[PDB]
Amino acid sequence: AVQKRVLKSNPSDLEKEIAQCLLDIELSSSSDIKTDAKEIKLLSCDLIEVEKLKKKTILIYIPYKIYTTYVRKIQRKLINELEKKTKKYVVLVAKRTILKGKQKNKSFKIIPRSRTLTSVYDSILEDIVSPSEIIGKRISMKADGKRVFKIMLDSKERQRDNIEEKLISFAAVYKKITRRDAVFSLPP
RNA sequence: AUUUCAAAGAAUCAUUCUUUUUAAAAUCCGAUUUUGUUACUUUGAGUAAAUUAGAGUGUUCAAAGCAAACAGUUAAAGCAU
């Protein structure tokens, strides 16, 4: 039924809930984003819980090609619709291969810039904020030798009441994905 | 300018030394083991002595030498039948 259609692999409970929700959104149709999710196929879904315990956040992995072509174009409205349907905080990300060019893999000449560790990690930072847009990045090196990514967003999100819970969620999600701490801010 | 950041453990006096894991391809029995060239650097191999540094060693000391030291009035010990 819904789960096999949305998720290619054998599906867990929250993967099946996402599949059900996504099918229900497509079937019901959200008027401005009509043809809502027909092209979508999912790789995986993951559940992450903030230390502050302001609900839960869901990370969803999507193929780069599907993500770029479909998801990116409607993403803020799409995530808001997914959030409205299931109240846990959703993030949509592209899976991206990261390549060590030392090994000389058959399918690539040289080193692609898109597959560099740094480019992918910056791209994943872009994916998590994606409905909102970065004004500037600044990396603070604290005295412990930890490095902290201070990410400035734009001033349009002062309308959104979910702001702080999403900022903590972005920090948590990035921290789970790789061992980089973020902090967030926006103009006064 | 530019391209793989890091994380956690253990040993040790919020420091220090050490170990584990975190993409992809090829290969072998879900797992097992490999992945640009050079500069630079690390260990090494193979190095004639005399000299030189430098140990051993009271040439009567020292420059030296490569020797010496030990027991025993004119013997025991040791190992051999």
Buried b (16+ CB within 10 A) or exposed e, A126-158: ebbbbbbeeeeeeeeeeeeeeeebebebeeebe
Burial bucket for residue A75 (CB in 10 Å: 0-12, 13-18, 19+): middle
CA dihedral A153, A154, A160, A161 (to 10 degrees): 50
Method by which this entry was solved: cryo-EM
Give me the A residues in range 126-145 that sit within 7 A (CB) of strand B: 145
Give me the A residues in range 161-180 that sit within 7 A (CB) of strand B: 178-180
A53, amino acid identity: L
Q: What is the resolution of this structure in A?
A: 5.8
Strand-pairing partners, residue A134, are A153
* C-beta pairs of A167-170 under 8 Å, 24+ apart in sequence: A168/A50, A168/A52, A168/A54, A169/A48, A169/A50, A169/A57, A169/A89, A169/A91, A170/A91, A170/A128, A170/A129
Contact in structure between A174 and A182 (CB atoms under 8 Å): yes
The CA distances from residue A59 to A25, A118, A124, A143, in Å, are: 18, 21, 12, 32
Q: How far is the CA of A174 from the C1' of B19 (A)?
A: 27
Q: How far apart are CA A50 and CA A128, in angstroms?
A: 15
* 3-class state of residue A45 by DSSP: strand
Q: How far apart are CA A95 and CA A47, in angstroms?
A: 16
A135, amino acid identity: I
Q: How far is the CA of A102 from the C1' of B39 (A)?
A: 20
DSSP H helical ranges for A44-149? 64-66, 75-85, 117-129
Decide: CB of A109 under 7 A of nucleic strand B: no
Closest by CA to A149, choosing from A157, A137, A135, is A137
Closest by CA to A170, choosing from A136, A140, A116, A127, is A127
Instruction: Name the closest nucleotide to A118, judged by C1' and CA.
Output: B5
Positive or negative CA dihedral for A107, A109, A110, A113? negative
Q: Which residues contact A170 (CB under 8 A, 6 or more apart)?
A: A91, A128, A129, A151, A182, A184
Q: How far apart are CA A108 and CA A170, in angstroms?
A: 32
Decide: CB of A114 under 7 A of nucleic strand B: no
What does the DSSP 8-state code read for residue A158? G
End-to-end CA gap in chain A: 49
Decide: CB of A123 under 7 A of nucleic strand B: no
